[PDB]
Design a protein around this ligand. Sequence first.
Ligand SMILES: */C(=C\C(=O)N1CCC[C@]1(C)C#Cc1cnccc1[C@H]1NC2=C(C(=O)NCC2)[C@@H]1Nc1cccc(Cl)c1OC)CN(C)C
Ligand code: NA
Ligand code: NA
Length: 308
Amino acid sequence: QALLRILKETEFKKIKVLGSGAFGTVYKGLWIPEGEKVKIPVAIKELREANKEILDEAYVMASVDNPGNPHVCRLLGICLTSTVQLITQLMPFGCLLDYVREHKDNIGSQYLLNWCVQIAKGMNYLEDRRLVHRDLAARNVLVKTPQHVKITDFGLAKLLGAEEKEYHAEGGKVPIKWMALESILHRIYTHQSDVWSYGVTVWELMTFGSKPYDGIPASEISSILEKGERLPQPPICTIDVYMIMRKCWMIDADSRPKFRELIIEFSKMARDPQRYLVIQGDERMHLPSPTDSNFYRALMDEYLIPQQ
Ligand SMILES: */C(=C\C(=O)N1CCC[C@]1(C)C#Cc1cnccc1[C@H]1NC2=C(C(=O)NCC2)[C@@H]1Nc1cccc(Cl)c1OC)CN(C)C
Ligand code: NA
Ligand code: NA
């Protein structure tokens, strides 16, 4: 049962903007729950004003909060100020798209494959809750630590009813370059169209944050996919890794891998990481980990109106 803890704005202090974009505005803050002594670092999201959209996101997140999952962003509550704001635990390393672009020189094969495992685990949990995310992308994965990522942004997410296998969309803006062909052509979304987006997300990580189909207009994408063209092989990917991406982008949705299968295959690759990704100076790379004594030192348009 979806519940919402309303947190008083007086319980938040030191609110400062972190960034803005198509997602709206996100701030960081310190939440001091009433009758408690602990100051909790939080992230706070609003849209650029409308209140229906942000409450729909709150409902979806609350609906999948029990039992929850380590690789899925949890809603702490909402706040009612001049606008409605969503509250979550601050992810101090930011989004995974920025992280891979900024730390390319220290991202080894073990990190990339573990992120693939973790996103597939979070997505498998969401599929088990009948949730179709509809906006899986590297920009919507957050970094709690370099070793632990979480799926975020439930702005397009839809819950499927007991007797429903797909969601049919109306004319809202959607991320064409992350979408399955059937979603671009017929506005149909399923757990298997989220698998297509998962393949694009994996390609974004393996290219250290390249823009997919860069310089190609979104209106040409369905014709390119119908001709059999796909995103290119990233140079660090051995053939078995690229073949996972190509299976995610199959025309037949039911033939694409399942999230449960992707957890197993990427977990196998993470057991011998240098066999599956070839990265120069891989064994000499290191990213901060909570087990490191000095870990505390580290803590100091994509969306368019559909044409078909
Ligand atoms: C990503 C950049 C990015 O996200 N950045 C860069 C500067 C900091 C900021 C805005 C952030 C963040 C962040 C940190 N801790 C927790 C959550 C968030 C947050 N970021 C984004 C979220 C999202 O929903 N959409 C995309 C960006 C996200 N989620 C939040 C924030 C507050 C409350 C809730 Cl409940 C919540 O999740 C629903 C790359 N850019 C291209 C987007
Ligand atoms: Na949004
Ligand atoms: Na299959």
